[PDB]
Every structure is written in C-alpha cells, then in structure tokens.
Symmetry: C3
Subunit: 27 residues, 3 copies
C-alpha cells in the first residue's frame, strides 16, 4: 500500500493512521 | 519513487530506510 | 496524490512541504 502526500504548509508531518500529523504534536 | 503506506494502529511513523518508524521511538 | 519515497540511509524523515525532513531536526 501507498500513502497520499502531506499538506504543503511548511509544517512537518508524521505518518500515523493513514494521516499526516504534525511532528510538533510529538514534540 | 513513492513510499508505501504505514500501519494504521494509531501510531506515528517517520520515514527512514524505506520503512515506517515509530516517531515515539525518537521521543 | 501520493508523496515520493524518502532516502534509505537510515535517517528518519518527516513529511513537510512535499519534502522529507530529518526527524532529528525536530529533536
């Protein structure tokens, strides 16, 4: 399987539950 | 040249060495 | 609408702005 691209808002995302979550949420 | 989808267990993954690595492992 | 694969040099990347950023940059 392959994931879909993450938003381009200059924010970092992590790949969780098929979605892009802000890395900062893990910070 | 895209990456494959990460697990959907509610965990966050980072993209390293062609694999999904638990973000929490980096925290 | 998927993202392209990150480097396979054992470094973890975060998805931000259509690019792979090192997770350690967030650590």
């Amino acid at each position: 399987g392959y994931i879909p691209e993450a938003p381009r808002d200059g924010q970092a995302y992590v790949r969780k539950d098929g979605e892009w979550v802000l890395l900062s949420t893990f910070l």
